[PDB]
Design a protein around this ligand. Structure first.
Ligand SMILES: Nc1ncnc2c1ncn2[C@@H]1O[C@H](COP(=O)(O)OP(=O)(O)O)[C@@H](O)[C@H]1O
Ligand SMILES: Nc1ncnc2c1ncn2[C@@H]1O[C@H](COP(=O)(O)OP(=O)(O)O)[C@@H](O)[C@H]1O
Length: 214
């Protein structure tokens, strides 16, 4: 099973990707996580992203295409994968198509813009794994601690209100056109498309996704 999650920053993609990876046994491919990890480790492929993410802007297509190509070639993707945060531009989607990377489901998270800032300013992450929490809306069992390892959560350097508003502008200009892109692909029979109400509680969105995926 191959899945793309579409939606604005803060729509809930990383949150729901974790459940899907747990239940269906396919890896989550998050370009944001991969880029942040490359910066942290000083990896030659991706360390360049530091100042760009800080500015709320998109990394170059060629950098994230290279990262994703490297990642999905790995054996743990042989049976499928989930993309969360990629593709982010029409050229990134076309690069997938040209490489023959078809997907089974495209799942769009519908969330009002007005909810995004308060979601992202409360976001806390377990950097080693990517797991995501919210201090008020989806808290860990123990404050400031990852549920799975118990390790300290952190706040992403780019999760400030003003940076979020810049990311939302980028989303509307560059990334929202992928909704139509994959709607058209679904009409051709190349994927299944579904839209979900991302304002429901985390557990209910999860249940809604399980209905679709099986
Ligand atoms: N259904 C929801 N209701 C309220 N908050 C949510 C919901 N889903 C996720 N969140 C929280 O909002 C923030 C954004 O979710 P996240 O999954 O990181 O979004 P994305 O990966 O789409 O940017 C996180 O702090 C997360 O805990
Ligand atoms: N596919 C991508 N193309 C370009 N830039 C990306 C991509 N994925 C992540 N980024 C960069 O990483 C930043 C954080 O993205 P991400 O972790 O997906 O956060 P959010 O879920 O809040 O959108 C983006 O603002 C951008 O700089």
């Amino acid at each position: 099973m191959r899945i793309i999650l579409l939606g604005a920053p803060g729509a809930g993609k990383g949150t729901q990707a974790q459940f899907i990876m747990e239940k269906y046994g396919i890896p989550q491919i998050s370009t944001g996580d991969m880029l942040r990890a490359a910066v942290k480790s000083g990896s030659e492929l991706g360390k360049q992203a530091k100042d760009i993410m800080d500015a709320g802007k998109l990394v170059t297509d060629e950098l994230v295409i290279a990262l994703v190509k490297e990642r999905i070639a790995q054996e743990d993707c042989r049976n499928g994968f989930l993309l969360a945060g990629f593709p982010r531009t029409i050229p990134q989607a076309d690069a997938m198509k040209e490489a023959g990377i078809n997907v089974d489901y495209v799942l769009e998270f519908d969330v009002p813009d007005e909810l995004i800032v308060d979601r992202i300013v409360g976001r806390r992450v377990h950097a080693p794994s990517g797991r995501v929490y919210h201090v008020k809306f989806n808290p860990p069992k123990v404050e400031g601690k990852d549920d799975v390892t118990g390790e300290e959560l952190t706040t992403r350097k780019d999760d400030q209100e003003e940076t979020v508003r810049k990311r939302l502008v980028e989303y509307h200009q560059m990334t929202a056109p992928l909704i139509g892109y994959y709607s058209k692909e679904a009409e051709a029979g190349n994927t299944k498309y579904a839209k979900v109400d991302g304002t429901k509680p985390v557990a209910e969105v999860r249940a809604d996704l399980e209905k679709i995926l099986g």
